[PDB]
Curated annotation (Swiss-Prot), chains A, B:
Belongs to the queuine tRNA-ribosyltransferase family. InterPro entries: ArchSynthase1/Queuine_TRR (IPR050076), TGT (IPR004803), TGT-like_sf (IPR036511), tRNA_ribo_trans-like (IPR002616). HAMAP family: Q_tRNA_Tgt. One of its GO terms (biological process) is queuosine biosynthetic process. Binds 1 zinc ion per subunit. The active site is at residues 92, 266. Catalyzes the base-exchange of a guanine (G) residue with the queuine precursor 7-aminomethyl-7-deazaguanine (PreQ1) at position 34 (anticodon wobble position) in tRNAs with GU(N) anticodons (tRNA-Asp, -Asn, -His and -Tyr). Catalysis occurs through a double-displacement mechanism. The nucleophile active site attacks the C1' of nucleotide 34 to detach the guanine base from the RNA, forming a covalent enzyme-RNA intermediate. The proton acceptor active site deprotonates the incoming PreQ1, allowing a nucleophilic attack on the C1' of the ribose to form the product. Changing residue 142 to A: Abolishes catalytic activity. It comes from Zymomonas mobilis subsp. mobilis (strain ATCC 31821 / ZM4 / CP4). The keyword Nucleotidyltransferase does not apply. This is Queuine tRNA-ribosyltransferase. The lineage of its organism: Bacteria, Pseudomonadati, Pseudomonadota, Alphaproteobacteria, Sphingomonadales. Substrate binds at residues 92-96, 142, 189, 216. Its EC number is 2.4.2.29. GO terms for cellular component: cytosol.
Amino acid sequence: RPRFSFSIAAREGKARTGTIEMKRGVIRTPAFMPVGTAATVKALKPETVRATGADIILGNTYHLMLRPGAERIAKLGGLHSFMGWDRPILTDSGGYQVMSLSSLTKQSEEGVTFKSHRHMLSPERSIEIQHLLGSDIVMAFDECTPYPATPSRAASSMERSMRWAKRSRDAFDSRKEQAENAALFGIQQGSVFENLRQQSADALAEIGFDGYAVGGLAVGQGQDEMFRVLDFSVPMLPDDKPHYLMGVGKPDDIVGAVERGIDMFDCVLPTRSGRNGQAFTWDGPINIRNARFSEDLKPLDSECHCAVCQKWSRAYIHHLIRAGEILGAMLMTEHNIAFYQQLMQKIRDSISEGRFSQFAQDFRARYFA
Amino acid sequence: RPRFSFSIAAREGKARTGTIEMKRGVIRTPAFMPVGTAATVKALKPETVRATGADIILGNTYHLMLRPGAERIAKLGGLHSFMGWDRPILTDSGGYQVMSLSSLTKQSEEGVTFKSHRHMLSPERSIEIQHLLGSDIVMAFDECTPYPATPSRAASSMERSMRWAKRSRDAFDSRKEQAENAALFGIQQGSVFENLRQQSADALAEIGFDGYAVGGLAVGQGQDEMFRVLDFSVPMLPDDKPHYLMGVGKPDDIVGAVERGIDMFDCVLPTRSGRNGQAFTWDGPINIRNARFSEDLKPLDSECHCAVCQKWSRAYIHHLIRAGEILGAMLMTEHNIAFYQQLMQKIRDSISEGRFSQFAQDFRARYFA
Ligand SMILES: [Zn+2]
Ligand SMILES: [Zn+2]
């Protein structure tokens, strides 16, 4: 396989289905990426993650740089060998978690220094760490914009992010091993403002990336607003490259995002919320801790083909989660990630068949009945 | 298969190797039983437990009667269907955990009432609950003796336990479905006193059981004392039935116990201590949390054939346990239970081959080097 090749096989409206070919494997799009925080998809062996249908996972640079350390991981052979996942890995830049989880941060035009929940990140250091991890898809380092944000603040942070985009581009390309074997994505910013989103798209396209993320839309916007901004933002991005909506999300958010041209997703909802008792079903989510499930012999979802739904009852998983048993987390997580992968499979097949609009309508009518 | 058939295929000294045939499967002896507390072997799917070589697991009646409830489990189809383990299950009587974990207990000749950490247990109720769970090997309900114990106290509790042994026998036999499909073991008591151990053995043999446990030797005795008491106690039991040492234990305890005629073991050490960072190896245990493992690419044990040692490094498991990641518990637990099963396999093969004395010497010289 090539370093990177995105091909669109079928379209319906703004929706697309296709493949990203990379050295470590093929990624089917639209794609959902299970989140591996600190070198693990919580409560699952990598073989189990693969068994659910995942083609690629996300790694959180911030957490990995703190524990176990980027240089240590490189010394040990890289993230893939360390955790036992040999397919593509997308790593974030670490910039978001600096702002949401670290302390005493100090931001400047060079980058950010911060205290672990003393460290540094910058466009150059972030791209370097992703290299040390052995990332297949590298994310440009940027500066987040909170929501809401004033237009001045949104513009300042977008502008800085585009300067850092160019710095990220240059750092990646100067490292031949990285440039020849990994891909680099740029992140569109601009908060909810169309003019700023357009300026950002133009700046990224001018620099040129392998794929384009829509950043900053999972920091408090509700769905209507997120979709409104996707409506004008995604068409601004190059059509022939992947479109990655960072941090999204709920099944209905995914469906609508794909209707608006998004090709890639990541979210901790299936893993986190599964540990917390929330199970996804085609009839909407349930909280397995509810007493109504204590003697329910049915599987978590009546149609789900995952191993969990083949072998255990709601009653059993209810018991495990109530008792705080690790197997409960394991089974909830496997199911939810398998659900999410079946959703993406239904989305891909329906776009391939020119029936995605119908699928989205049917999905919604039942999920929200 | 029959309800119950124990056959001895080979002997060396007091050691024995053979099989217990039961309706749900064959148990190879000497046997190690992973402990399933509240309907789970912590951090492992039942298929994984089986993959390590386990032929049978233990279920803790006390915990199950509290959560999710014995009657509920029966309504749901029994413990095997509930948790997804279809091979034999041995259930304890719940009496030990009443004494070590419950409060405000009230003991009498009829049984014990107690508060959950309000409930009751008695010979009749304990055998009933084991029935409701669908247990294959049922343990008689008795009264524990602390260590140390005075001879008067030891004798009183032993005597009561033998009265309760007869009550347990009668309750089991009166329930035809249970009597025809499960087995009943009696428990020898007597603290560390030879005369009391002999009286207890005689009383149990007179009543007649399918197998005979040595109780009360994992409550503070060190190894020398435990072995001293096994030296005279195990020969008192019927030779042609299984000998179950409850609550033991460490690898060297198992080896020495088998040298003294024990056929079955259970302990929470491999599972519990694995969650806590202790990994068993042929060169003795290690604590994976120690900084010396942070960049150790070797597997947990150099010879272990488990899946964990095939795929992950010490460095990785060190990271997971330090980070409190569930996968760390999962991998440590799988390894330790696989270690324990490989130990039992080496013990069985060496007895079959008439070289167990040599095996015990070699084992020790390396495990304690
Ligand atoms: Zn499922
Ligand atoms: Zn191993």
